[PDB]
Every structure is written in C-alpha cells, then in structure tokens.
Design a protein around this ligand. Sequence first.
Ligand SMILES: *[C@@H]1O[C@H](CO)[C@@H](O[C@@H]2O[C@H](CO)[C@@H](O[C@@H]3O[C@H](CO[C@H]4O[C@H](CO)[C@@H](O)[C@H](O)[C@@H]4O)[C@@H](O)[C@H](O[C@H]4O[C@H](CO)[C@@H](O)[C@H](O)[C@@H]4O[C@H]4O[C@H](CO)[C@@H](O)[C@H](O)[C@@H]4O)[C@@H]3O)[C@H](O)[C@H]2NC(C)=O)[C@H](O)[C@H]1NC(C)=O
Ligand SMILES: *[C@@H]1O[C@H](CO)[C@@H](O[C@@H]2O[C@H](CO)[C@@H](O[C@@H]3O[C@H](CO[C@H]4O[C@H](CO)[C@@H](O)[C@H](O)[C@@H]4O)[C@@H](O)[C@H](O[C@H]4O[C@H](CO)[C@@H](O)[C@H](O)[C@@H]4O)[C@@H]3O)[C@H](O)[C@H]2NC(C)=O)[C@H](O)[C@H]1NC(C)=O
Ligand SMILES: *[C@@H]1O[C@H](CO)[C@@H](O[C@@H]2O[C@H](CO)[C@@H](O[C@@H]3O[C@H](CO)[C@@H](O)[C@H](O[C@H]4O[C@H](CO)[C@@H](O)[C@H](O)[C@@H]4O)[C@@H]3O)[C@H](O)[C@H]2NC(C)=O)[C@H](O)[C@H]1NC(C)=O
Ligand SMILES: *[C@@H]1O[C@H](CO)[C@@H](O[C@@H]2O[C@H](CO)[C@@H](O[C@@H]3O[C@H](CO)[C@@H](O)[C@H](O[C@H]4O[C@H](CO)[C@@H](O)[C@H](O)[C@@H]4O)[C@@H]3O)[C@H](O)[C@H]2NC(C)=O)[C@H](O)[C@H]1NC(C)=O
Ligand SMILES: *[C@@H]1O[C@H](CO)[C@@H](O[C@@H]2O[C@H](CO)[C@@H](O[C@@H]3O[C@H](CO)[C@@H](O)[C@H](O)[C@@H]3O)[C@H](O)[C@H]2NC(C)=O)[C@H](O)[C@H]1NC(C)=O
Ligand SMILES: *[C@@H]1O[C@H](CO)[C@@H](O[C@@H]2O[C@H](CO)[C@@H](O[C@@H]3O[C@H](CO)[C@@H](O)[C@H](O)[C@@H]3O)[C@H](O)[C@H]2NC(C)=O)[C@H](O)[C@H]1NC(C)=O
Ligand SMILES: *[C@@H]1O[C@H](CO)[C@@H](O[C@@H]2O[C@H](CO)[C@@H](O)[C@H](O)[C@H]2NC(C)=O)[C@H](O)[C@H]1NC(C)=O
Ligand SMILES: *[C@@H]1O[C@H](CO)[C@@H](O)[C@H](O)[C@H]1NC(C)=O
Ligand SMILES: *[C@@H]1O[C@H](CO)[C@@H](O)[C@H](O)[C@H]1NC(C)=O
Ligand SMILES: *[C@@H]1O[C@H](CO)[C@@H](O)[C@H](O)[C@H]1NC(C)=O
Ligand SMILES: *[C@@H]1O[C@H](CO)[C@@H](O)[C@H](O)[C@H]1NC(C)=O
Ligand SMILES: *[C@@H]1O[C@H](CO)[C@@H](O)[C@H](O)[C@H]1NC(C)=O
Ligand SMILES: *[C@@H]1O[C@H](CO)[C@@H](O)[C@H](O)[C@H]1NC(C)=O
Lengths: 574, 574
Amino acid sequence: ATFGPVFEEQPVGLLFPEESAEDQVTLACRARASPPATYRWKMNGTEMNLEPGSRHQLMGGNLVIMSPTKAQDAGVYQCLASNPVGTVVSKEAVLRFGFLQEFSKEERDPVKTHEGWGVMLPCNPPAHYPGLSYRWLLNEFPNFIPTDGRHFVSQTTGNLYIARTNASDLGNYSCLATSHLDFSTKSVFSKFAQLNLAAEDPRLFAPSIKARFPPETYALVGQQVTLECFAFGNPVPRIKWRKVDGSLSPQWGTAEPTLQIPSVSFEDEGTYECEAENSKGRDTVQGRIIVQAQPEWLKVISDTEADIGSNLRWGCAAAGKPRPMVRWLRNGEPLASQNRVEVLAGDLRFSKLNLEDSGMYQCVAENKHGTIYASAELAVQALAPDFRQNPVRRLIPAARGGEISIPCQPRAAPKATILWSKGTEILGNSTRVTVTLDGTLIIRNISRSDEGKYTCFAENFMGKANSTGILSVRDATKITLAPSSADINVGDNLTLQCHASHDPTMDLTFTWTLDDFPVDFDKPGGHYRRASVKETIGDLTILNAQLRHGGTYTCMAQTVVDGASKEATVLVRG
Amino acid sequence: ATFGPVFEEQPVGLLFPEESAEDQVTLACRARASPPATYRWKMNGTEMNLEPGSRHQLMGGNLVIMSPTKAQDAGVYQCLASNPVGTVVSKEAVLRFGFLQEFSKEERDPVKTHEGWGVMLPCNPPAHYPGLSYRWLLNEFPNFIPTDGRHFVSQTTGNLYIARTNASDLGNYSCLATSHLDFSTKSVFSKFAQLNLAAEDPRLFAPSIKARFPPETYALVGQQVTLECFAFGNPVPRIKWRKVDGSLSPQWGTAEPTLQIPSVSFEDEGTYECEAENSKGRDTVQGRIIVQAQPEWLKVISDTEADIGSNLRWGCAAAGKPRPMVRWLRNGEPLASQNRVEVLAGDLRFSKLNLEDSGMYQCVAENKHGTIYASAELAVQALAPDFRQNPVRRLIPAARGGEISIPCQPRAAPKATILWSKGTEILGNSTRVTVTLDGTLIIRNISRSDEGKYTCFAENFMGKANSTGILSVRDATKITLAPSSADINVGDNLTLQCHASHDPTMDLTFTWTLDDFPVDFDKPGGHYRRASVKETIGDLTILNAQLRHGGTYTCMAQTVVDGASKEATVLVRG
Ligand SMILES: *[C@@H]1O[C@H](CO)[C@@H](O[C@@H]2O[C@H](CO)[C@@H](O[C@@H]3O[C@H](CO[C@H]4O[C@H](CO)[C@@H](O)[C@H](O)[C@@H]4O)[C@@H](O)[C@H](O[C@H]4O[C@H](CO)[C@@H](O)[C@H](O)[C@@H]4O[C@H]4O[C@H](CO)[C@@H](O)[C@H](O)[C@@H]4O)[C@@H]3O)[C@H](O)[C@H]2NC(C)=O)[C@H](O)[C@H]1NC(C)=O
Ligand SMILES: *[C@@H]1O[C@H](CO)[C@@H](O[C@@H]2O[C@H](CO)[C@@H](O[C@@H]3O[C@H](CO[C@H]4O[C@H](CO)[C@@H](O)[C@H](O)[C@@H]4O)[C@@H](O)[C@H](O[C@H]4O[C@H](CO)[C@@H](O)[C@H](O)[C@@H]4O)[C@@H]3O)[C@H](O)[C@H]2NC(C)=O)[C@H](O)[C@H]1NC(C)=O
Ligand SMILES: *[C@@H]1O[C@H](CO)[C@@H](O[C@@H]2O[C@H](CO)[C@@H](O[C@@H]3O[C@H](CO)[C@@H](O)[C@H](O[C@H]4O[C@H](CO)[C@@H](O)[C@H](O)[C@@H]4O)[C@@H]3O)[C@H](O)[C@H]2NC(C)=O)[C@H](O)[C@H]1NC(C)=O
Ligand SMILES: *[C@@H]1O[C@H](CO)[C@@H](O[C@@H]2O[C@H](CO)[C@@H](O[C@@H]3O[C@H](CO)[C@@H](O)[C@H](O[C@H]4O[C@H](CO)[C@@H](O)[C@H](O)[C@@H]4O)[C@@H]3O)[C@H](O)[C@H]2NC(C)=O)[C@H](O)[C@H]1NC(C)=O
Ligand SMILES: *[C@@H]1O[C@H](CO)[C@@H](O[C@@H]2O[C@H](CO)[C@@H](O[C@@H]3O[C@H](CO)[C@@H](O)[C@H](O)[C@@H]3O)[C@H](O)[C@H]2NC(C)=O)[C@H](O)[C@H]1NC(C)=O
Ligand SMILES: *[C@@H]1O[C@H](CO)[C@@H](O[C@@H]2O[C@H](CO)[C@@H](O[C@@H]3O[C@H](CO)[C@@H](O)[C@H](O)[C@@H]3O)[C@H](O)[C@H]2NC(C)=O)[C@H](O)[C@H]1NC(C)=O
Ligand SMILES: *[C@@H]1O[C@H](CO)[C@@H](O[C@@H]2O[C@H](CO)[C@@H](O)[C@H](O)[C@H]2NC(C)=O)[C@H](O)[C@H]1NC(C)=O
Ligand SMILES: *[C@@H]1O[C@H](CO)[C@@H](O)[C@H](O)[C@H]1NC(C)=O
Ligand SMILES: *[C@@H]1O[C@H](CO)[C@@H](O)[C@H](O)[C@H]1NC(C)=O
Ligand SMILES: *[C@@H]1O[C@H](CO)[C@@H](O)[C@H](O)[C@H]1NC(C)=O
Ligand SMILES: *[C@@H]1O[C@H](CO)[C@@H](O)[C@H](O)[C@H]1NC(C)=O
Ligand SMILES: *[C@@H]1O[C@H](CO)[C@@H](O)[C@H](O)[C@H]1NC(C)=O
Ligand SMILES: *[C@@H]1O[C@H](CO)[C@@H](O)[C@H](O)[C@H]1NC(C)=O
C-alpha cells in the first residue's frame, strides 16, 4: 500500500514581532507517506541547509528558524515533501517582520499662516510594516489634539488638515503613530513642530480639497477599503459621498470625510465621487474602486491508476480577476511538453503512458495576487507474466502419429513474448513443429522420441515466467476391423463387428450410435444386443430388424484419453 | 627608562539604546608604559578570548563589541593593563541595555469592590531597564484617565489608586508605560482589566494610606528624590507634606501626593511626614530621606623607590556617607596581610622590603554606591657602594694631640659594611684608634707619625668600593698667654693681650669680639686699636674707655684650618 506524499499541514505566513517575544519561528509542514516522507525547505527559490547544528533547523517536518532576523529570514518559504514515489511542493508562506522605528530627530520646520485659513501639518512617519494609526499631540505628550469637524488626521499619509485655523490653534503639534492591531501596542511620537498665526482673515473661502483619494484603488474581495476626502473652507465644509450611477448603502452615514467599505464585494466596484460644499462654493473629486481577486480552484486532478500505454487527459481550472495563468510540475519541477506528454496551459495530455510517467504531478495557478497548488499521484499499472490462471497442464497424453496442441496463456500488462523449449533445446517453425502466433505449440506425427518436458517461457518489460508439462506418447486406439454397409430384410438378424486395438494400460469402451442416437441395448422391449465384450472386439446384433433400425450406424471405441471410430450404413427393405 | 603602567583613558559605563545608531560599542582603555602595555579584558569576572574575526575585537586596547546584545554583553567590564613591572585594574564600567518590552498578552483578571470604597488596579509592567512614566487608559486607547485628585497613578509601581470608587468609575482600565530616555518615544499599554462595582456603601471611611513611601529612601547629593503618599477616604483626603523638624522649602507645593526634591542636598536629609486628612479622620506616614555619597579619595599612594630592607608606610583614605571600606591589590590580586607585610584597612606597612615586593600596588575603596581605585609602582633598589656623590675628605688637617673624626657614608642599597686602613694595614678599636658603629674613624692623640693615606673600604650584597684621603696633621694652634678680666674707669686706657703660637707653615690671624660683635678697629670715630700684629702676639687697646666698651671680650687666634680662643670680662665704671 505505497502512495505518494499527501500534505496534511501546510505552511502559513507569519508576522514576527521585533520586540522579542520568542527567539524562534516554526513554519509548519507535514505529509502522509507510506514510506515516511522527507521534507526539504526552499527560501526565495533556494535550498536551505537544515543539517544539525545549523540555524535553520528541522523538527519533524516543521522548519524552525532560531533568532529570526528581518534582514536575513524575511521572504518566501516553500516545503517540498518527497519520497520514493515523487515530490510535492506546499503553499508559499511569507515570513514578514513587524516593527515601528522612531521619528527622525531632525528638527521639523514651523508652519505659519493667517488665522482663519486652512493648513496642513505633515507627519512623515518612519518605516513600518504592519500598519499604523496616526494621531496628533498638542504641546506636551499626554495632551491630544481636539478631535472635531474642523480637524482631520489622514490615516494614510499621517498628515493633519485644519479646515479653519482657529485662534486656539496657536501651539506645538507632533505626530503619533500607533501600530495597534491584533498583536502589538508600540507607539512613537515625533518632534514638535510649531504653528504660527498672523492677523485674522475672515474673508470667505470656496471649499478646496486638500486630502484627496487615489484615482485608481485596487482591492480584493473580503478586504476593507477606505477613501479620504477633506477640504479647506471658512464654513466647516460638509463632505458628501456618492457612487456614479450607484445606489450606495443606507446604513453607512456617508457624512464624514472617511468613506469605509468593510468586506468590499465585486458589486462595490466602480466610480466614487466626494463633494465638499459650503455656503460659498463646492468642490469634487472622483476615483475608481477596481475590485480584483486571488486564484481559486474550479477543477483539479486526482489520484489515478492507468494501464500501460493508455491515454490520460488531466485538467486544472482556476478563477481570479487577473486571469490566473496555469502551470504544471512533475515531482516539484517544471513540466514542459515532453515527447510522451503534451502540456497546454490548463490541459495535460498523456498519450500512450509509460512506466516512467508514474509519480507526483501538480497544477499551479498564479496571478499577480498570489499562487495556488493542487497535487495528485499517477500510477501506471504494469504486470509480470503470470500463470496462476490458464496453466500449461502438468500431463499431456498423446497417441502415436497424432497431432498435439499445447496452449500457453500468460497474463502480462504489455503483451508477453512467448517461446517454447523442450528440455534445454529451443523449438521453432519446422515441418513437424509449429510455434503459432497466439502461443500454442503444434506437434504433428508424434513418436515415442518426443516424450518429455515441454516448457513455455513468457517475458515482458517487467519480468519472466515459465511453466512446464509432461508429454507421454501412447499407442493409438485404432479400429483394426471396421464394419461396412449392409442391406437386409425386415425380421432378419444383422451383426456389425468392430475389432479394435488399444494400449493395454487403459480400459476400452465400445459405443454404437444410430444417426446420433445412443443405441439403448438395455431398453424395455428393445431390439438390440451388445455381443460379449472382449477388450479388443465389440459387436452389435440387431434382432428382428425393422424399418426403424436402419441408418448410419457408428462404432466408437474409446479409452479415457483416446478414441477411434468407424461408420457403416444399414438399409432395411423387403 | 622603564616604568609601570599608568592609565590614561579608562572605560565608561554605557546605556545602549534600543534601535541604536550603530551596531558596535567601544569601551575605552589605554595605558602609558615604556614597554607598550598589554591590555586584558574581564567581563562579569571572567577573562575574554578576543580576536580580529571574533565579536570581541580590540583596537589600541579599546574593546569593541559588534552588534551588542543585551543577553550576551550586558554586565560589568574591567580593563587590566599589564607589563613587565606589574598589572593594574581599571574602573568597573557597566554596559546596560535600555529597552521596553510589551505587556504579557494574557488577559488580566478583573477587580471588584463596593461603590464608594477605594481600590487599587495593578499595572504589573513588562521587563524594562530605564525609568518609565506610567499612565492609565479607560476603555479605549486614545481615552485617558481623568487626573484630578481622586485618582493617583504611582510612577514607581505603575499601579492606579482610586480613593473613592465613584459610580462613573465602572469600566475597563489598562496601564500604559512610556520609556522616555536619552532617545526613545516608545510607549506600550496592557490588555484592559475590568472594574466591577457592587452596591453603594454611603458610610464614610476613615482615611487609610495605601500608596506609601519607604521608611528609608537612599539617595545621593545632587540626585532627585520623589516620595509618594496616597490614601483612601470617602471625602477626597487632603494630603500635606512636612519635615518633622525642618523649615523645608516654600517652592515645593507639599499639596499633591508626590513630594519632589530635585538636586537633593545634604540639608534635605532627615525625617519627613505625609498627612492624609478628611472630615472623619486622619492618617500619617513617616520616613527618612538619608543622603549618601560615593567614595572619593583623600590620601592615596604614589610611585616610590625604596632601598632593600626598608620600612614603608603607605596610606589610602576615602570619604563617603557609608564609610568606604579600603582594600589592597598587588598586580590585580587581593593583597592580604602576609608574613612580611601588614595590612589594616587603610594602611599598608612593609617591614624590611625585599626584591620580591617590587611591582604595581593599588588601593581600592568601595561602599554600597560604588568603588574607586588608585595605583602606584614600588621599586626596591639594589645598589653597589658608590662614593662619587659623597667621597671621603680628600684633605684632613688636624692638630698635634687632637682628636680626628673621619666619616664614611657611601650610597648602597643595604647599609655598607665599613673598614678603615692606613696604607696597607687595617685598623681596629685600639686605645687611640676606633672604627665606630656609624662608620666614622676616630683617632686620638695624633702625632706626625700618623700623617699619610687613610682609606675607607665599604661593601654590601652587590659590590665593594673604596676611597682614600690624606691626613696631614702638623701642629696645634695654642694660646700661651690668655687675657683675664679687668676693671677700669671711664676715660682710662686698657690693654688685653693674647699670646699665641702656631705652625710656622701657616699665617696667623687675630680676631677680637665683644659679646658676639666684631670689634671694628677701623670704625669712623671709634675707640679701639689693634696693636702691631706679630705672628705670635695680638693686643687690643681700648682708648678713652666708656660704659659701652665693656663686656665679655673674646680673643680668637686662628689659622685657615685651626684656631684657639680665650675670653675675658672687662668692667668699666662711672
Ligand atoms: C679600590 O681598589 C681597587 C682594587 O685595586 C681599584 O680598582 C681598580 O681600578 C682600576 C682602574 O681604576 C682597574 O684597572 C683596570 O684594569 C682593567 C683590566 O683588569 C681587568 O681584567 C683583568 C684580566 O685582564 C682582571 O684580572 C681584573 O680583575 C680586571 O677585571 C683594564 O682593562 C682597565 O683599563 C681601562 O681603562 C684605561 C684607562 O685608565 C683604558 O686606557 C683601557 O683601554 C681600559 O678601558 C677599556 O674599557 C673602556 C670601557 O670601560 C673602553 O671604552 C676602552 O676603549 C677600553 O676598551 C683598567 O686599567 C683595576 O683592575 C681595579 N682593580 C681590580 C682588582 O679590579 C680601585 O680603583 C680602588 N678605588 C679607587 C677609588 O681608586
Ligand atoms: C522458471 O521459473 C522458476 C520459477 O519462477 C524459476 O525458479 C526460480 O529462479 C530464481 C532465479 O534463478 C530463483 O531465485 C534465485 O535463488 C538462488 C538461490 O537458490 C536457492 O534458494 C532458493 C530459494 O530462494 C531455492 O528455491 C533453490 O532451490 C536454492 O536452494 C539465488 O542465488 C539467486 O540469486 C542469484 O542470482 C540473481 C539473479 O538471478 C542475482 O541477482 C543474485 O545476486 C544472486 O547472484 C536467485 O535469488 C528462485 O529460487 C527459483 N525458484 C524457487 C522456488 O526457488 C526458474 O529460474 C525459471 N527458469 C528459467 C530458465 O527461466
Ligand atoms: C527574499 O525575497 C524577499 C522578497 O523579494 C526579499 O525582501 C525584499 O527585499 C528588497 C530589498 O531589500 C525590498 O526592496 C525594498 O523596497 C522598498 C520599497 O518597497 C525600498 O524602499 C527598499 O530600499 C532599499 O533598497 C534601496 C536600493 O539600493 C536602497 O537605496 C535603500 O536604502 C534600501 O536599502 C528596498 O528596495 C523588498 O521590499 C523586499 N520584499 C519583501 C516581500 O520582503 C528578501 O530580501 C530576499 N532575501 C534576501 C536574503 O535578500
Ligand atoms: C553578568 O552578570 C549580571 C549580574 O547578575 C547579569 O545580569 C543579571 O541577570 C539576571 C537574569 O537575567 C537578573 O535577574 C533578574 O532579576 C530581576 C529582579 O529585579 C527579575 O525581574 C528578572 O526577571 C527577568 O529576567 C528573567 C531571566 O532570568 C526572565 O525569565 C523574566 O521573565 C524577566 O524578564 C531577572 O530574573 C539580574 O538582576 C541581573 N543582574 C544585574 C546586576 O543586572 C548578566 O546577565 C551577566 N551577563 C552575562 C553575559 O553573563
Ligand atoms: C510459424 O508457422 C505458423 C503457421 O503458419 C505461423 O502462424 C501464421 O502466421 C501468419 C502471419 O501473421 C498468420 O497470418 C495472419 O492470419 C490472420 C488470420 O488468421 C490474418 O488476419 C492476418 O492478416 C495474417 O494474414 C497466420 O494466421 C498464422 N497461422 C494461423 C493458423 O493462425 C507463424 O507466424 C510462424 N512463425 C514464424 C516465426 O514464422
Ligand atoms: C470592557 O470589557 C468587557 C469584558 O470584560 C467588555 O464586555 C464585552 O462587550 C462586548 C460588546 O461590546 C460583548 O460582545 C457581545 O457578545 C454577546 C455574546 O456574548 C453578543 O450577543 C453581543 O451581540 C456582543 O457581540 C462581550 O460579550 C462582552 N464581554 C463579556 C465578558 O461580557 C466591554 O465591552 C468592554 N468595554 C466597556 C465595558 O466599556
Ligand atoms: C513650541 O516650541 C517652541 C520652540 O520651537 C517653544 O519656544 C520656546 O519657549 C521657551 C519658553 O518655555 C523659550 O525659553 C525658548 O527660547 C523658546 N524657543 C524658541 C525656539 O522659540 C514653545 O514654548 C513651544 N510651545 C509651548 C506652548 O511652549
Ligand atoms: C475657536 O475660536 C472661537 C472664536 O470665536 C472660540 O470661541 C473657540 O473657543 C475656539 N476654540 C474652538 C475649539 O473652537
Ligand atoms: C512420422 O515420423 C516417422 C519418423 O520420423 C516417419 O517414419 C513416418 O513416415 C512419419 N509419418 C508421417 C505420416 O509423416
Ligand atoms: C434370427 O434369430 C432368430 C432367433 O431365434 C431365429 O429364429 C431366426 O431364424 C434368425 N434368422 C437369421 C437369418 O439368422
Ligand atoms: C462622582 O459621583 C458623583 C455623585 O454620584 C457625581 O456628582 C460626580 O460627577 C462623579 N464624578 C465624575 C462624574 O467625574
Ligand atoms: C671594634 O672593631 C670591630 C672590627 O671592625 C667591630 O666589629 C666592632 O663593632 C668594633 N666595636 C666598637 C665598639 O666600635
Ligand atoms: C699622647 O701621646 C704622647 C706620645 O706617646 C704621650 O707622650 C702623651 O702623654 C700622650 N698624651 C695624651 C693626653 O694621651
């Protein structure tokens, strides 16, 4: 019960915190294999030395990296479970390192404007992977900006937009990035910039958008998307969201600068418009949400057994907005269209399979948004010659000068080459002997010099087999004195003789038939008699012959392995 | 030209910031030594195996640790400068690593009490070296606890004390530590615990202090100290700070739970009391601020050369509030009171120094607040006798029948064994001649038969030396006729005679003094006369004697190498 490796647990991307919770990362990998599978690991498309005492160690099937490093172990990892049958690759798992550096200590320039205008204070946050929440601080660290409708902190660029510079906005402002997500609370603030306010300018301002959203925003199904839109206007501009020829949703307020779509569906695709309006004017900005999707299987291959030289068509299909391109792998290696097998994107056609094509195959569909794998095992079924059924027959009795037919019926996956040999001597097509196509051995005019062992030898790709039989030449049961025809009247007696000879070792049985009817000489009220049976001679006496006791009589002198026969014609008539 | 090692640059403790600028730390160490010194390094009291390609590199004695690690290189470091003369230890420099891990992800159990009572919510902050600033959050992260006087966050344990559990205090509370140091804005908060509020208890509560300060708070002059004091009392307890018997300072508010002494002086030492008072009662807590100080030298040892078998008293003294305990080190190893040398706290007495005692010595004074070192070199001097610096009296005039003392004081490591020889014959303690203990040769009742060469032979461990001097005693200057006293009237003349004898080879000079005043016989308008000087006789004539021309006259007849003297008393009368 040997089979190829089947993945049970596969790797999973991991975000490794920098603050050192543990000094080890364990990427999982595990496979069912009759002969336990050996696991190899490939980072960034290159083998990893997992020998003992190395940093990149192995525990069962799981890859353990000690003291993970963002500069050394960040990137892709792949598991290859292999065994005598073949090799299979697992999902690609990304090891990413989350962190949050601190703000550059370089002093931040101050910003100065007339009171009553709008202004922007930039955050310019430091390098960070997992994601940030941007807030702003006034003067001292504990104190926070008054969060209202006149202020808005962009949570993509971190900047701070003030629609109307108020007299109370004269002070110092710093940025604060907080990486708060599922795991991690690290938070860092920046050097304080300063906001200077000149004389007031009560002059009314038509709304002008300064926090815009991208013209093209690509997101995947199930993901969340957020659009930002904020403007400067002396009356706090009211922000409205709409969809170009779209009903939108009633539950969403759609009144704040941030439009939030959780679990973006494909229907949420399309053009969106933001409008910032105030008593003195209005401004607008538009942009498209272009929904995309990762690959997902539709049809895939399955473990299959196929006879040698068969035709096998395998197909894998996948769905995804960027049309997933499909590829094939044999034992974890690129499978190009070989001589025996044709490869065309999603179809793999084996024409006249061979024993070499068996093994582990995989179809892999990828787009710019990722990759997916599906594996299966191909078993081409061979078979050595087997004589378990239809044997050659241990004993072959014959008769002097008779014909003999000895069958040979091996069963082998590819057609078995057959040969016949008597003792140690091979046999061919002679005048007397014939080795037919089907395999039967034909011997003609047999003599006692042919007695012996005859063996059939069968072979093929896989193996060889042989079977023997004994050949025993006996005397032929023969009729020495045969009865001829006769003509007789009704009421008169007739005698048909049959003088035969046979091998003494065997008993002899005489039979008399009449137009294929068994002459019942023991019939109630019959009209026949079998003469005194000596082992050589047999006679049939018809007493009180009648018109119905005539026809083609047949004498048949048989032994338990041989028989001879003669025919006579009896005509009654008066 | 060879001398012991003298430290010029010494190591310095270092706080390695989290996410430093570079991944290398250079602990300085350098020593002046005529034959360049070898530098050894000791981490946590264990030798360090350094090399170029190793992590622990060396550059001019300075220790460079690449990619510093808190788990591998945190702790004490010491430099040992060694050379043929000896070994010396450097200051202890601590390499510490500042950081701030995040709170344990395990959810923290809720705390429950009766409404109107006081309560404490523990922070249990994560591992951290540098000081932290603890605040608390209510429900969500942006929102902060209202700091008003009913709440108090201990900035030593991080806990949160609520004096009166108010109906509005029912909610979720988390701790937030901010690790603000030289460069760091890191801030991490904990998973939210929950506060459960039972039925109200309107009964007033007598104040009970729960956030106390230690009875003994140890601090150094110039440092800052902070005392915390907060209590539970149903009426918001008023907190007052005072000193049991000190005028204290007006600038300090003494109204908040935290009493702050920046730059604590020695006068700020003493007992302090905090008083929490409310309508229904009062409670107090007392404790002493005990000002202390680090060790600082007062007297220390110095580089010394000492002759073999000398007595050497060394002393090192130090000042510090915990009296610094003094120890000694020989070539960087503990110097216990051995057989030859006595050690008593701050004093080290070498008795009969030997060639083995040379080397580098150090005195090390330590108290609970640190350690201080002072080094010096001890050179024990061997030396053969040398007379180049103090040769023997090359010329020795004396007087017939007089006593002669000829010193012999060579410069030798151990005192030189001395012998005296005239010509080729050695001298001992005879009736006239004696070879004294100090080494001086004493000759008595000398005659012209002793004139000749006298040589001192000195020896010691190392070598032998000798030096000669001529002895030329020719005759004793003697007074044959001495003047006696006299009594005279004013206006009359007096004559004081002095008849002397001298060796013919030398001239003779007469001197007349009057009560240690040189009788000026060439005085403008004087009243003296020195008679006609013959080489044998000298007379002083006082003409027109006066009350001021009397007293103890002294005749002094001298040659340039010998002299005799006599004294008379002249009494004038009016
Ligand atoms: C106390 O009593 C002692 C005992 O008498 C007396 O010491 C004697 O000092 C004199 C010099 O003042 C020594 O005379 C020297 O003798 C050596 C040879 O003697 C040595 O070798 C023999 C074997 O050959 C040994 O048996 C013996 O013990 C000695 O070890 C001479 O070589 C010396 O000559 C040098 O100085 C001359 C100038 O006067 C040079 O012209 C001459 O070239 C020699 O100089 C060499 O060395 C120089 C470097 O130092 C180099 O620059 C030159 O170019 C040259 O190569 C010298 O005549 C006598 O040996 C000592 N006695 C003993 C027993 O050793 C002390 O003088 C006396 N104390 C006082 C105060 O006088
Ligand atoms: C016709 O078909 C029959 C039945 O299949 C064959 O009989 C078998 O033949 C094979 C191969 O000759 C035999 O296997 C061989 O056994 C040798 C030892 O023989 C002893 O042990 C067996 C039991 O294992 C006894 O039956 C036998 O009487 C002996 O006591 C091994 O030495 C052989 O290995 C050697 O040769 C092979 C290559 O053949 C090498 O790879 C090896 O390294 C080694 O050098 C081999 O294992 C088998 O034992 C036979 N049957 C039985 C029941 O034993 C006939 O051979 C076949 N005839 C023809 C002409 O095709
Ligand atoms: C294994 O494969 C992963 C994935 O490809 C790989 O991680 C990648 O490393 C490169 C280079 O370090 C990263 O490229 C960066 O891209 C950002 C913008 O996205 C740039 O700001 C970065 O700038 C660096 O490089 C510049 C070019 O010289 C420098 O001027 C600059 O100062 C920075 O040093 C950099 O170009 C890429 O983002 C990652 N991708 C992922 C998914 O991690 C990893 O490095 C590979 N393994 C090894 C050992 O290299
Ligand atoms: C050189 O010697 C110094 C001095 O011993 C040594 O530093 C010491 O390390 C131990 C263990 O790291 C410290 O023991 C700590 O005690 C405090 C109590 O104040 C505990 O809170 C600490 O708990 C933390 O560390 C544990 C590790 O044992 C963690 O399991 C735990 O979760 C906490 O994170 C800890 O037990 C000891 O205080 C210091 N001593 C000094 C003076 O700092 C240093 O490690 C040595 N260096 C080398 C390279 O050997
Ligand atoms: C040894 O002699 C025997 C007997 O002649 C040979 O068997 C014969 O082989 C031929 C060659 O293929 C067969 O011809 C075929 O006949 C079938 C119909 O049976 C026909 O459909 C084919 O197109 C082809 O013509 C012939 O049938 C067969 N004899 C019998 C009785 O079946 C054998 O080939 C000889 N061996 C060698 C090695 O020469
Ligand atoms: C403070 O912490 C407590 C937990 O200690 C928070 O209570 C939790 O509140 C959420 C909703 O805000 C509850 O979720 C609810 O779950 C029930 C099923 O259990 C479901 O029917 C509701 O639709 C909702 O999803 C959660 O169960 C609850 N936890 C417990 C243990 O009761 C609380 O929200 C936090 N904030 C406060 C109190 O302001
Ligand atoms: C905002 O930052 C400025 C400096 O950029 C602070 O101005 C300093 O104010 C102190 C008074 O506490 C003066 O001693 C300094 O000379 C000022 N420096 C400069 C460059 O002007 C200002 O105080 C900060 N904001 C607030 C509210 O204090
Ligand atoms: C803004 O300016 C107005 C001026 O009328 C003032 O009343 C108000 O207190 C200031 N602060 C805020 C937060 O609006
Ligand atoms: C049969 O074989 C024998 C011996 O080979 C031969 O004498 C005889 O004539 C043969 N008979 C026929 C019918 O071929
Ligand atoms: C036939 O047998 C019967 C039996 O008795 C006999 O009567 C008759 O004569 C026989 N006929 C011939 C022709 O043998
Ligand atoms: C505390 O409780 C009192 C009475 O229940 C209430 O008046 C007061 O506002 C509360 N404190 C707050 C809400 O900060
Ligand atoms: C007498 O001379 C001997 C020999 O030099 C010396 O050892 C001894 O000390 C001398 N005694 C005195 C009293 O000087
Ligand atoms: C000194 O020595 C001389 C000669 O031996 C002798 O005549 C005289 O008496 C001695 N005087 C003294 C005081 O020793």
